[PDB]
Design a protein around this ligand. Sequence first.
Ligand SMILES: CCCCCCCCCCCCCCCCCC(=O)OC[C@H](COP(=O)([O-])OCC(O)COP(=O)([O-])OC[C@@H](COC(=O)CCCCCCCCCCCCCCCCC)OC(=O)CCCCCCCCCCCCCCCCC)OC(=O)CCCCCCCCCCCCCCCCC
Ligand SMILES: CCCCCCCCCCCCCCCCC[C@@H](O)O[C@H](CO[C@H](O)CCCCCCCCCCCCCCC)COP(=O)(O)OCC[N+](C)(C)C
Ligand SMILES: CCCCCCCCCCCCCCCCC[C@@H](O)O[C@H](CO[C@H](O)CCCCCCCCCCCCCCC)COP(=O)(O)OCC[N+](C)(C)C
Ligand SMILES: CCCCCCCCCCCCCCCCC[C@@H](O)O[C@H](CO[C@H](O)CCCCCCCCCCCCCCC)COP(=O)(O)OCC[N+](C)(C)C
Ligand SMILES: CCCCCCCCCCCCCCCCC[C@@H](O)O[C@H](CO[C@H](O)CCCCCCCCCCCCCCC)COP(=O)(O)OCC[N+](C)(C)C
Ligand SMILES: CCCCCCCC/C=C/CCCCCCCC(=O)OC[C@H](COP(=O)(O)OCCN)OC(=O)CCCCCCC/C=C/CCCCCCCC
Lengths: 98, 347, 56, 121, 107, 459, 54, 140, 70, 53
Amino acid sequence: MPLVYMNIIMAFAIALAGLLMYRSHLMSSLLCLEGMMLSLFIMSTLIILNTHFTLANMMPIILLVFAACEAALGLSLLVMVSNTYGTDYVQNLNLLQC
Amino acid sequence: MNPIIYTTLIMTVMSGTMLVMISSHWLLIWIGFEMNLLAMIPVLMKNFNPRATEAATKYFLTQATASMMLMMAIIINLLYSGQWTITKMFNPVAMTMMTMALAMKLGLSPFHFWVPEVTQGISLQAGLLLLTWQKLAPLSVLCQISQSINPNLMLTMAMLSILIGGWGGLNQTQLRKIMAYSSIAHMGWMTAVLPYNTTMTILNLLIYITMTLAMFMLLIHSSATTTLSLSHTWNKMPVITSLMMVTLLSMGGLPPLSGFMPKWMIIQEMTKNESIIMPTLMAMTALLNLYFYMRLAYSSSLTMFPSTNNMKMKWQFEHTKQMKLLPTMIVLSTLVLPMTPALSSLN
Amino acid sequence: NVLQIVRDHWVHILVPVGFVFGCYLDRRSDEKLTAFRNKSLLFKRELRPNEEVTWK
Amino acid sequence: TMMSGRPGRVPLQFLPNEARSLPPPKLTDPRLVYMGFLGYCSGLIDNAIRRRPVVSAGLHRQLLYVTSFVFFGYYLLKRQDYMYALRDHDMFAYVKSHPEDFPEKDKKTYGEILEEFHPVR
Amino acid sequence: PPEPTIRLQEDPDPEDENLYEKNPDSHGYDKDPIVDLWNMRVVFFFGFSIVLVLGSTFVAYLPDYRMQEWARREAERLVKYREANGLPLMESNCFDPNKIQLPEDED
Amino acid sequence: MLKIIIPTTMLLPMTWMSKHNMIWINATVHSLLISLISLSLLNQLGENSLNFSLTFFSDSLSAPLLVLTTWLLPLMLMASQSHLSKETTTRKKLYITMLILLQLFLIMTFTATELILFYILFEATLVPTLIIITRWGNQTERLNAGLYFLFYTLAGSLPLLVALVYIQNTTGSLNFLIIHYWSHPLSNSWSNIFMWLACIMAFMVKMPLYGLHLWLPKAHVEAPIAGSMVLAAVLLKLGGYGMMRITTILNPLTNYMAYPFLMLSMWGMIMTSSICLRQTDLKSLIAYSSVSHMALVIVAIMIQTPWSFMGATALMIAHGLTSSMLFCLANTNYERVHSRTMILARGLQTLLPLMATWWLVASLTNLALPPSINLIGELFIITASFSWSNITIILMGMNMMITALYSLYMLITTQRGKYTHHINNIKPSFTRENALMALHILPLLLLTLNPKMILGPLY
Amino acid sequence: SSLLDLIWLETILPKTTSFIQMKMSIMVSNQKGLIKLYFLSFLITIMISMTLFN
Amino acid sequence: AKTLLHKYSDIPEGTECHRKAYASTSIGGATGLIVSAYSIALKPPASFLEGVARTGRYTFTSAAIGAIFGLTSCISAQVREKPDDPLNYFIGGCAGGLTLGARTRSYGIGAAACAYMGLTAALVKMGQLEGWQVFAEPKV
Amino acid sequence: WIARTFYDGPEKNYEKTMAILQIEAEKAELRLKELEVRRLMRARGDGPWYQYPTIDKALIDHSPKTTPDN
Amino acid sequence: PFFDVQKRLGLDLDRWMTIQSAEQPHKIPGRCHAFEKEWIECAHGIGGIRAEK
Ligand SMILES: CCCCCCCCCCCCCCCCCC(=O)OC[C@H](COP(=O)([O-])OCC(O)COP(=O)([O-])OC[C@@H](COC(=O)CCCCCCCCCCCCCCCCC)OC(=O)CCCCCCCCCCCCCCCCC)OC(=O)CCCCCCCCCCCCCCCCC
Ligand SMILES: CCCCCCCCCCCCCCCCC[C@@H](O)O[C@H](CO[C@H](O)CCCCCCCCCCCCCCC)COP(=O)(O)OCC[N+](C)(C)C
Ligand SMILES: CCCCCCCCCCCCCCCCC[C@@H](O)O[C@H](CO[C@H](O)CCCCCCCCCCCCCCC)COP(=O)(O)OCC[N+](C)(C)C
Ligand SMILES: CCCCCCCCCCCCCCCCC[C@@H](O)O[C@H](CO[C@H](O)CCCCCCCCCCCCCCC)COP(=O)(O)OCC[N+](C)(C)C
Ligand SMILES: CCCCCCCCCCCCCCCCC[C@@H](O)O[C@H](CO[C@H](O)CCCCCCCCCCCCCCC)COP(=O)(O)OCC[N+](C)(C)C
Ligand SMILES: CCCCCCCC/C=C/CCCCCCCC(=O)OC[C@H](COP(=O)(O)OCCN)OC(=O)CCCCCCC/C=C/CCCCCCCC
């Protein structure tokens, strides 16, 4: 396992950790999710190209498409949340408590 | 929304689950999960209010993170073995990340935090769908890759789920949070037998789904979401309160009720594998679920709470919409213990 | 008056019907445990000229 | 015993053809009677919920419930018996094909076995 | 403080009702005299007449399935035989030693 | 065995299809007929057992308990007929349904060829009792009493299920006959020690043991009269039956293991008999007397000698009948006084002479006066304990004395002296109550003529 | 009657269990609903699982 | 991970008291740090300095508990000349429990700690002796 | 009269108990054998039970692949 | 769980993309075609457990 794959997985772990920190700005949560899918795309593309799995060249595009669709949904949700409060701050969603 | 749109979204949710269940390719499983996630969001927001929007966005965030972890596990598995078929996981912690993603999808501890919030935010029908249908696909994947799981991690998260559900149900006055913690504890019971017997997992899933359907339909019929709001049901529909109390006793695992069948079997199975301490601890912890079920039963039908004057008008009207499957659900969740050996049908 | 007291006193017949049904079911369940009939070491016996089974 | 991977198994076959060599459950089977009783209880609860005379509101509805319950119970019992027959057949075949793992124990009489005696005092 | 000092609209606690006042010979069974008398009669007949008498007689004359007289006759015949033979009554060993195979110690 | 079970099941449709004012009459008559049917089981053999089928068998330990369980239902119906007068037909039918279900569960529990079936029914008996206690209860603490009764039982019994499934996994069968013939010694090991504890504590909690007896005063005081009757008469004997059934597998580990329990019971009988002396409540006093008697039964079972087992069986039957009678008497007083405290209503012998005679007979039979079966069990257990150790008698001696004391104390506080001047609603005793006491007391004095009928399988 | 039966025997089994379960329920269920804390806990448990179970 | 378990279990019970005490102290410190991280993540009390003080308090309490456990159990096992006896673990376990009670300064919590830690230590010793499995592998 | 009309002989109960014991002993030994067979099959993988799916070899393409060395 | 509809109906919904050595377009071989071919042939029908050992 070369160092490039390790760097990509480290990048994904950093994006996931930053998503889990939640300083503020749920928009940053969506940004972290998109960084995660970008790292997934890059490493999956590198693995597939390297092993010459010709039919697997389908998979990255599919992934991209689906992930981007998810982003759209998320953005819509964000707007409505903002549409209630005027700002996308995380701490505004304190109505529901365990 | 438009009934045609609602029907299309429900069919899309079910088609995503079926695509997960019938496919042998990891990418198709991920696509089915994506389809289910996409079609589930409007269902949680049928009744538009800030609470439902907050619940939907929390659910979307958790499920999207779970899907990303699932894809990373799939890609690492492909890296260490050029395989896409759903089989033995072929690798170290790639399996750990797969288990974490499936646990977040199911709501197992320590990823349980979103279930009570999403259940409280959404209505009762959305909560019914969320707590019943959304468990089939991740449990199917876990049953498929059960021989790969590390028993230590799975058993740890199962015991954590049971403990957290038992403790968190004690503090609730809202009925939806009670149902959410019950779901967490039941999933904990389900996943503790996956390393040993997947048939027992499926049996527990069937029994739990029947009991949850009966409970949610009874809660919808007597439209109460709070303990005190439920305490007013006896003055109109005492038979509903009696059926609800019997169902709650069944969900507590009391013999000879139906809810005793899974735990019993599970305990039995775990004793075949030279495991005693965990079954003992699981029973002693499910005692807490029984305690808060019994408190709800006290507040529901065993005592008569004060009523209000306007209640008299409700005496003059009858429910226009009637649920056809409610009678069957109650009987199946109450009186199917003698048919226990039928579990050999590999349900 | 017949056909009138029946509609009110019909319930009484149920317990005795259950009793006779239980007796019949007990005999029927007994019929399935005859694998060792007239085969015990303590009671091996030669059948009578007009006997088929030692016990029913 | 995970029989999902059994060789020569049709994926979505509820009852395989080889199950037809097993005796079907009798129509007076106690489990079938219990399923009919479950259907009758379902009918009674259905009458009670909709605020109808519990015993004598719908005879057709109760009959339909009982009949459907009996039908499903008969097929479920067939599948149950078939699966248990498969389990026993597999166990016996494995015991037959692996003699070294299941040795014949030497028959020993109690007169030549020494069991420790613990008095009750 | 304009509060009515009443927590809620409640029925007053009813006083206990006597079955003797509205009906002498009330038997303490029911407020309806006919059901009263018939309940008394059926309880007395099916408890004292049927169960306590016929059941006690049935239990008294139960056949000897415990085999007490059988055991007494067996012991009588056995002792009659043993005394005559000169055998020493009951043996110490419950089973014959010749058919018991002890394990040899060789210690 | 179905000749008893099927009529008990048919009791339910008969009750629910009964005319609105004929439920009590129909229920009592058919319950008495079913009791008569149950009498056939008493003719036991000196051989193995009455093995009816693969699912149910009878034994001369099971037969007296079955007969008592069947006989208790008409008495419970007659006792409950009074305070359920102002109640709707549906709820009275539900009450009768719960009583019938309790009888059915007990009947299936006492035959129970298999231990898992026994456990399932043993815990199935819990639901009707809990509902009866928490629904038709007068005070506000019935909910807490129901919670205590449920959770003590389940905490005791949850390890029992694990122990049973483990035992079946190792041995291969949970059947009583197979277990008895294939019993093998248990090595003195930590795992075996914990298996013994799991097998024993579930039945110990229901006796109940002196350490674990708290739920019982709450449950007895807060339950209605039928609930108190069924708790004191039958439900306490389930633990003793379970111990006598399960102890066979336990040896030789029981000797070392038994000491903590033997000491707890021998001191707890004294403690509870002494507690009875200073009590302000009839129901609590009867409950503590029951605790003392069942502690003695625990001692008898733990000694595990033939005389111990015969004494335990006789004492269980006698205590069931006597405690049911005592609770019935206390309820007759309560229905007139509505206070349920001894010191309020006094001198009742002057106003109710026949009821005072019933009180005297009940207190005498609780006192273990010879040749009643109460003293038969008392003396058999005492002799077995003396053979076990010559010092036990001293404790036993104290117990007997203390018992007599509080018994006559309960007879003197409420019946003798001067009647309270203010109470004027003490009406003459009804025929129903006198019939209830007569039907409670006559079986004891009939059984003392034929003690072997209740002395168990080791007779 | 009072020292052992009404107080200490009550203190040991039932009251201790009630107090412990009450405290555990209060601790577990007292979450303010901030997904910040939830996901920080998620990160902590993910890293702990990566460090402990392999 | 299991490195601390291997370090603790490899040392004989009746010898090397200091090594056992050090291993127990390390295990206790790790447990206290994990609990502190959980508490900080779930509840930010007021600030960084209060949080680090809380983590230090929890870690030192757990480390002291473990150290007392190890030293007392090992010393009791060595002096009694009867190793593989759960009673030694009982005594050491609630010496640790009593130290916890002294740290929290409550007699009731000290007695509760003695009960519920001596019993737990005895149970762990019995499990080690008899081979009980907390997380059994799937045998069949 | 009671023995004639209500009860039966000892042979009936004796032989019924013999049959019941025989059936129960067979069930117990079958349970032990089934547990042992399950344990053996799971570890070895030789038996019909516990079969986990592998890649089907009918999916492999056996054709020249534009390169002589596959 | 897994409902093997493809095998029951003979549809081949996604089995074409599972392995490297399964009918690539224009007969383009994977980098490890021979090794995967050998491993698949060896493990066919053996089962996962015996296959793994
Ligand atoms: C062990 C196995 C063997 C036994 C099986 C046990 C189970 C069997 C039954 C299962 C369920 C089926 C029936 C239940 C439906 C409910 C309907 C109802 O309430 O009854 C009203 C109805 C009469 O009322 P109605 O005039 O129609 O109208 C009044 C309204 O209905 C209602 O009036 P209302 O609303 O004004 O009254 C209010 C009341 C009314 O509320 C209720 O009564 C609710 C009903 C109970 C809940 C059922 C839950 C589901 C079943 C669970 C069973 C649990 C068993 C396990 C053990 C645990 C015990 C809990 O509710 C309350 O008072 C609130 C508080 C209640 C107290 C606490 C609640 C505890 C209830 C638990 C009961 C468990 C046993 C039930 C037995 C049957 C009871 C009917 O009763 C009946 O007539 C039907 C009874 C059965 C019919 C028998 C017919 C057969 C006879 C002819 C054939 C011969 C057979 C042999 C053939 C050969 C012979 C020749
Ligand atoms: C809670 C009570 C249970 C009730 C459940 C709902 C009842 C209504 C269902 C109506 C009929 C459903 C049957 C479906 C028709 C054909 C099914 C067939 O094609 O599928 C087969 C399988 O048949 C079904 O699985 C059997 C379902 C029957 C469930 C009954 C068991 C209930 C548990 C015992 C409680 C008693 C309940 C009795 C009252 C209903 C092939 O499965 P296979 O592709 O090879 O492998 C997948 C399953 N594996 C992975 C576990 C091995
Ligand atoms: C009111 C004042 C008195 C007036 C009346 C005066 C007359 C007094 C006479 C009454 C008793 C005095 C003693 C006389 C005894 C003579 C009868 C006795 O000998 O018979 C007994 C018979 O009694 C029965 O054995 C005991 C009664 C059975 C008890 C069963 C209870 C009834 C069922 C009700 C429900 C059960 C509830 C409790 C559950 C366990 C003992 O018989 P036994 O010596 O052996 O052998 C009989 C002959 N054999 C050999 C041919 C068989
Ligand atoms: C609260 C109301 C009453 C509830 C019920 C109470 C009854 C249950 C109590 C259980 C009785 C004792 C349990 C174990 C007894 C074993 C014998 C032991 O005491 O003697 C010595 C044992 O020495 C010490 O006792 C070692 C154990 C010390 C740890 C136990 C904790 C002591 C007090 C705890 C009491 C708390 C009980 C309730 C918990 C919730 C013998 O030395 P040794 O030869 O080596 O061991 C022999 C056993 N072998 C053969 C299996 C090895
Ligand atoms: C002078 C007489 C003194 C003694 C009186 C004894 C009275 C005995 C009453 C108690 C009987 C208990 C019931 C016994 C049931 C078990 C036996 C049962 O099987 O008998 C059945 C018959 O049982 C009877 O029908 C029970 C009668 C119950 C009624 C008793 C009298 C009271 C009835 C009251 C009814 C209502 C009265 C009027 C109300 C207005 C037929 O059995 P069967 O399968 O062939 O057995 C064959 C055995 N063989 C092979 C050896 C031949
Ligand atoms: C008050 C009741 C008395 C309580 C006395 C002790 C209390 C302290 C114990 C607390 C719970 C401890 C849980 C863990 C105990 C572990 C015991 C154990 O595992 O033994 C199982 C033993 C052997 O294990 P294997 O590994 O399979 O054997 C192979 C190698 N020989 O097998 C068995 O016997 C299984 C039986 C289950 C054991 C029961 C566990 C619970 C404790 C026993 C019951 C006592 C408490 C009852 C509560 C009373 C409330 C009314």
